[PDB]
Amino acid sequence: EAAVCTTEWDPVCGKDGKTYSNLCWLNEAGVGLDHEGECL
Ligand code: NA
Ligand code: NA
Ligand code: NA
Ligand code: NA
C-alpha cells in the first residue's frame, strides 16, 4: 500500500486504544480520534 504519512511524532489516541504517530496515521487507518496525545 502506498506510504502516505510522515514519521513526525505528534501522537494521537485512537478509539481502538492504539497510539497513532500523528493524525495522518489515524485518519488513514479509518479510526476515530479519542483524544490528542498518546493513549494512556
Ligand atoms: Na497491495
Ligand atoms: Na521519516
Ligand atoms: Na482495541
Ligand atoms: Na475522547
Author numbering: 1 to 40
Describing publication, verbatim:
Unlike most Kazal-family serine proteinase inhibitors, where each functional domain consists of 50–60 amino acid residues with six conserved cysteines, GmSPI-2 is a single domain inhibitor of 36 residues with only four cysteines. GmSPI-2 has been classified as a non-classical Kazal-family serine proteinase inhibitor group 1.
The resolution of the crystal structure of 0.98 Å is the highest for the Kazal-type serine protease inhibitors deposited in the PDB. The number of reflections per parameter justified refinement without any stereochemical restraints for the well-ordered parts of the inhibitor. The fully exposed reactive site loop (RSL) of the inhibitor presents the P1 site with the Thr7 residue. The GmSPI-2 RSL has an additional strong (2.86 Å) hydrogen bond stabilizing the RSL between Thr6 (O) and Trp25 (Nε). The crystal structure includes four partially occupied sodium ions. The coordination number of Na103 and Na104 is 5 and 4, respectively. These sodium ions are coordinated by oxygen atoms belonging to the GmSPI-2 molecule (Thr7 Oγ1, Asp16 O and Asp34 O and Oδ1), as well as by water molecules. The His-tag cleavage site was located between Leu40, and Ser41 of the fusion protein. c electron density map for Leu40, the last residue of the mature inhibitor, is excellent for both the main-chain and side-chain atoms including the C-terminal oxygen atoms O and OXT.
